Swiss-Prot record:
Molecular functions (GO terms): carbohydrate:proton symporter activity; D-glucuronate transmembrane transporter activity; sialic acid transmembrane transporter activity; sialic acid:proton symporter activity
Tissue-level expression: In the adult, detected in placenta, kidney and pancreas. Abundant in the endothelial cells of tumors from ovary, colon, breast and lung, but is not detected in endothelial cells from the corresponding normal tissues. Highly expressed in salivary glands and liver, with lower levels of expression in brain, spleen kidney, muscle and pancreas. Expressed in acinar cells of salivary glands (at protein level).
Main location: membrane
GO biological process: amino acid transport; monoatomic anion transport; monoatomic ion transport; neurotransmitter loading into synaptic vesicle; response to bacterium; sialic acid transport
Transmembrane segments: 11-31, 46-66, 73-93, 95-115, 137-157, 164-184, 216-236, 265-285, 302-322, 328-348, 360-380, 394-414
Keywords from the named record: Amino-acid transport, Cell membrane, Cytoplasmic vesicle, Disease variant, Glycoprotein, Lysosome, Membrane, Phosphoprotein, Symport, Synapse, Transmembrane, Transmembrane helix, Transport
Topology versus the membrane: Multi-pass membrane protein
Presence of keyword Phosphoprotein: yes
Family listed: Belongs to the major facilitator superfamily. Sodium/anion cotransporter family.
Lumenal side: 94, 158-163, 237-264, 323-327, 381-393
InterPro entries per the UniProt record, alphabetical: MFS, MFS_dom, MFS_Na/Anion_cotransporter, MFS_trans_sf
Protein encoded by which gene: SLC17A5
Protein name as catalogued: Sialin
Pathology linked to this chain's protein: Salla disease: Sialic acid storage disease (SASD). SASDs are autosomal recessive neurodegenerative disorders characterized by hypotonia, cerebellar ataxia and intellectual disability. They are caused by a defect in the metabolism of sialic acid which results in increased urinary excretion of unconjugated sialic acid, specifically N-acetylneuraminic acid. Enlarged lysosomes are seen on electron microscopic studies. Clinical symptoms of SD present usually at age less than 1 year and progression is slow. Infantile sialic acid storage disorder: Severe form of sialic acid storage disease. Affected newborns exhibit visceromegaly, coarse features and failure to thrive immediately after birth. These patients have a shortened life span, usually less than 2 years.
Length: 424
């Protein structure tokens, strides 16, 4: 009975599909702006980057709001709000650029609150023994959502008007909120259709007694060198990721001169490669831990190096290659794929440094690392007004320099193990 297709896993498959919508509402514009150029606008990096001006605001308060309101209502209203605001995207564009900025900034105010709400919900819906599997199932939703949203947006823009994407995904989100509400409960005890049995989750949670003091010593937290190393490393990685996420379709259209359908397919190939590389790299890291006796810090630093320096090399190789179609696409795809190793880098490091105080450190390392989201598209769409090869190469060079600096900082300052300030 508790094998599959019932109870907890059901919740999982509602989050995964749900996250399939969520990240889509962030990745569709990068394709839609390719089709919408129809309006005339320059230095439109603000349009692409405003989504962060709300992501950074709501990244931290997510946990505090989820503790009181609860994961169900918080996540449901966040997704409903972002879907509704996506439904209003063409109207906001019609009114003007400023309305689009303010609408796409209110989006992201519901995007960032999703992860803390989901984490709070599975703080009670997920037994510790199988928590990793469920968390992986849910968080694969974001990657698969991007990977499927790019081709879908490209196809809809090629066969129909661009605005329909902001409709299509939007209604799906509403449909999600039209179903999730009557299939998910905040706590397992209050849930219906669970029926008898399935007391494994409650008994396991009660026996584990995962509740801690939660003293949140912010002063030692802000004076922890490995934490700042992780922050800088995630800053660099998010800079590269957001530059290659909000501007890749623009790069393909302006420079590679691909069609919209091609701009939707060959732009999704890199992220599909990254997701597959993540899946394989989890097992690769497990085998490296098992077969060879390597310290945790060494494993983290070598994975971070091989997953950041490599992206810098292949991204600077994306430039200097000219307008060659296949070679440039292959270099970009390999860059993102090789950056896929970073999953066994930063993230599974913040758990190592302080397992007890996880989440708070995750919030710190996410809020400081979305400044790249705000400043990357703006500074990258600027400095390339003429869409020349050299102008884009300058952006690629600065991204590679940021990655090299971040990798050196991380491998020189991260200490691993468990830090003193977080020990019972």
């Amino acid at each position: 009975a508790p094998v599959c297709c019932s109870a907890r896993y059901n919740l999982a498959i509602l989050a995964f599909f749900g996250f399939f919508i969520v990240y889509a509402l962030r990745v569709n514009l990068s394709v839609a702006l390719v089709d919408m150029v129809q309006w005339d606008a320059e230095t439109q990096g603000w349009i692409l980057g405003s989504f962060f001006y709300g992501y950074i605001i709501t990244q931290i308060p997510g946990g505090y709001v989820a503790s009181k309101i609860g994961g169900k209502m918080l996540l449901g209203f966040g997704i409903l709000g972002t879907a509704v605001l996506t439904l209003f995207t063409p109207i906001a564009a019609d009114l003007g650029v400023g309305p689009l900025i303010v609408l796409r900034a209110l989006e992201g105010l519901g995007e960032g609150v999703t992860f803390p709400a989901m984490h709070a919900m599975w703080s009670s819906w997920a037994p510790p023994l199988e928590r990793s599997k469920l968390l992986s199932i849910s968080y694969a939703g974001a990657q698969l959502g991007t990977v499927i949203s790019l081709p879908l947006s490209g196809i809809i823009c090629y066969y129909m008007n661009w605005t329909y994407v902001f409709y299509f995904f939007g209604t799906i989100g509403i449909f999600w909120f039209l179903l999730w509400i009557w299939l998910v409960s905040d706590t397992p005890q209050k849930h219906k259709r669970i029926s008898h049995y399935e007391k494994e989750y409650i008994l396991s949670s009660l026996r584990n007694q995962l509740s801690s003091q939660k003293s949140v010593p912010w002063v030692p937290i802000l004076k922890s060198l490995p934490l700042w190393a992780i922050v800088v490393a995630h800053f660099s990685y998010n800079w590269t990721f957001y530059t290659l996420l909000t501007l890749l379709p623009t790069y393909m259209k302006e420079i590679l001169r691909f069609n919209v359908q091609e701009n939707g397919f060959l732009s999704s190939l890199p992220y599909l490669g990254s997701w597959l590389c993540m899946i394989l790299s989890g097992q690769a890291a497990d085998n490296l831990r098992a077969k060879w006796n390597f310290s945790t810090l060494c494993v983290r630093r070598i994975f971070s190096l091989i997953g950041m320096i490599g992206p810098a090399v292949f991204l600077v190789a994306a430039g200097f290659i000219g307008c060659d179609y296949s070679l440039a696409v292959a270099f970009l795809t390999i860059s993102t794929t090789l950056g896929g190793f970073c999953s066994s880098g930063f993230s599974i490091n913040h758990l190592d440094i302080a397992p007890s105080y996880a989440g708070i450190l995750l919030g710190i390392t996410n809020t400081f690392a979305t400044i790249p989201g705000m400043v990357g598209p703006v500074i990258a769409k600027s400095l390339t007004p003429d869409n020349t090869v050299g102008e884009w190469q300058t952006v690629f060079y600065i991204a590679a320099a940021i990655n090299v600096f971040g990798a050196i900082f991380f491998t020189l300052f991260a200490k691993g193990e468990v830090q003193n300030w977080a020990l019972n």
